[PDB]
Amino acid sequence: MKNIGWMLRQRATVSPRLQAYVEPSTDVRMTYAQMNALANRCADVLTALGIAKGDRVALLMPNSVEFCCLFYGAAKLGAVAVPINTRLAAPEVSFILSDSGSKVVIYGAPSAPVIDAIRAQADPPGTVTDWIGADSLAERLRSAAADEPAVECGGDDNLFIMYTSGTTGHPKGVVHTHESVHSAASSWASTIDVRYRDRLLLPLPMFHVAALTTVIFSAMRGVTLISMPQFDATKVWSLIVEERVCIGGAVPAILNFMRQVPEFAELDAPDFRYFITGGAPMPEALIKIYAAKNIEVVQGYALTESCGGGTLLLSEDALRKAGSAGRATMFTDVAVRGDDGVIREHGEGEVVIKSDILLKEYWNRPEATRDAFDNGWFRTGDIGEIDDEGYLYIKDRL
Ligand SMILES: CCCCCCCCCCC[C@@H](O)NS(=O)(=O)OC[C@H]1O[C@@H](n2cnc3c(N)ncnc32)[C@H](O)[C@@H]1O
Numbered sequence: 248m249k250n251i252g253w254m255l256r257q258r259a260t261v262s263p264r265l266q267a268y269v270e271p272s273t274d275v276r277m278t279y280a281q282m283n284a285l286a287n288r289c290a291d292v293l294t295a296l297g298i299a300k301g302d303r304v305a306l307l308m309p310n311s312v313e314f315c316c317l318f319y320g321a322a323k324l325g326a327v328a329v330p331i332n333t334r335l336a337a338p339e340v341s342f343i344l345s346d347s348g349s350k351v352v353i354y355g356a357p358s359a360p361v362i363d364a365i366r367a368q369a370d371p372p373g374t375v376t377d378w379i380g381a382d383s384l385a386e387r388l389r390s391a392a393a394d395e396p397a398v399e400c401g402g403d404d405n406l407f408i409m410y411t412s413g414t415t416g417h418p419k420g421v422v423h424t425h426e427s428v429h430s431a432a433s434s435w436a437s438t439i440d441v442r443y444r445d446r447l448l449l450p451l452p453m454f455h456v457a458a459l460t461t462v463i464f465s466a467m468r469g470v471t472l473i474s475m476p477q478f479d480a481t482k483v484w485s486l487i488v489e490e491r492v493c494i495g496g497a498v499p500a501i502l503n504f505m506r507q508v509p510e511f512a513e514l515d516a517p518d519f520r521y522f523i524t525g526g527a528p529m530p531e532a533l534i535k536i537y538a539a540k541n542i543e544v545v546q547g548y549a550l551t552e553s554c555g556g557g558t559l560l561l562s563e564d565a566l567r568k569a570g571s572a573g574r575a576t577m578f579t580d581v582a583v584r585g586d587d588g589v590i591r592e593h594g595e596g597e598v599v600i601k602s603d604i605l606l607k608e609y610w611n612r613p614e615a616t617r618d619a620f621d622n623g624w625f626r627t628g629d630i631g632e633i634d635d636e637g638y639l640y641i642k643d644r645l
Pocket residue numbers: 411412434435438439456457524525526527528546547548549550551552555556557558559572576627629641
């Protein structure tokens with residue numbers, strides 16, 4: 248069986264001295280050997296905190312090496328990580344904590360006021376036994392052992408619970424296993440043009456499924472993650488050039504706001520090849536602007552339930568199929584479910600997905616889980632059309 252945590256170790260075996268995590272703003276630089284060593288300390292810390300295989304560990308903190316190492320460490324233990332959106336208010340964070348039955352919460356200094364509010368409320372999440380802030384994590388990690396854990400786990404064992412974007416009415420925990428995450432990161436590494444030793448810019452919050460899949464897929468391919476904790480458009484370009492970024496993740500808005508700053512006018516980053524985007528189509532204009540600087544753009548379509556995987560639109564078809572979500576990526580099949588309940592490869596209907604990247608279930612939501620599955624196919628709830636060329640077009644929501 249595959250184990251996301253073991254994979255980090257294996258990467259540290261293959262490329263021990265390869266730069267794995269680069270964070271300028273904080274001057275935090277680490278090789279894969281060091282990152283894997285930090286995860287082991289993280290695993291030791293969690294164990295002493297009473298975390299056992301299956302147990303949930305909440306992570307409320309800014310992007311950081313600690314975040315990645317904590318879930319990687321959790322992965323080696325068979326524990327389940329619950330990364331939480333840091334823009335969330337106390338009552339919502341509290342909801343996620345009790346719904347997930349998290350027993351340990353690791354939080355950053357910026358989230359202290361949120362953790363304090365929850366702890367002062369009437370009826371705080373009963374399952375939480377420890378609230379570990381930045382200071383305590385530092386203290387604990389310092390006396391932590393760096394030994395490699397020895398726990399047979401992985402495969403279909405839970406690894407993460409990602410709660411569906413804020414609200415739409417039904418906030419649910421999306422549970423992914425080592426296999427579904429492995430398959431997703433595998434899908435990405437096999438679909439987009441990623442290369443060993445490439446340097447990739449991650450400006451997205453690490454609680455986001457796409458971002459999570461990015462740090463994991465980076466370890467799998469042996470990519471140097473370039474971290475920009477809090478996106479800042481006044482520094483993003485110099486980071487791209489000074490750190491010799493080859494690939495960058497972003498949303499259409501960011502890119503449109505980025506080709507505006509002064510630094511853009513005469514940008515000269517030889518190493519930078521393309522941006523990956525999703526969540527909204529890319530305006531033919533915004534594309535051409537970037538095509539100008541010889542910068543390519545790949546656009547994808549995915550959900551939390553698909554672990555950030557799904558369809559993708561290669562640059563070459565950006566204008567030819569502008570307004571399209573692309574085609575199915577490696578290791579994943581996409582089609583449409585009619586009103587007759589019949590699934591077809593072409594035509595309009597509800598976009599359905601069949602791949603190993605799919606969630607195991609909705610955390611403690613039996614009915615929702617069974618209603619999202621139809622003979623192996625996951626119903627996205629999105630209406631769309633697939634043309635004879637096999638390109639997907641996202642319409643309204645079912
Ligand atoms: C192999 C590499 C794959 C790279 C995939 C990058 C995906 C970036 C977006 C991730 C979205 C994922 O996080 N799910 S979600 O919780 O954010 O929301 C999912 C919903 O967002 C919408 N929705 C996502 N992408 C789109 C879209 N490209 N075009 C119209 N709509 C969309 C659609 O309603 C979908 O059901």
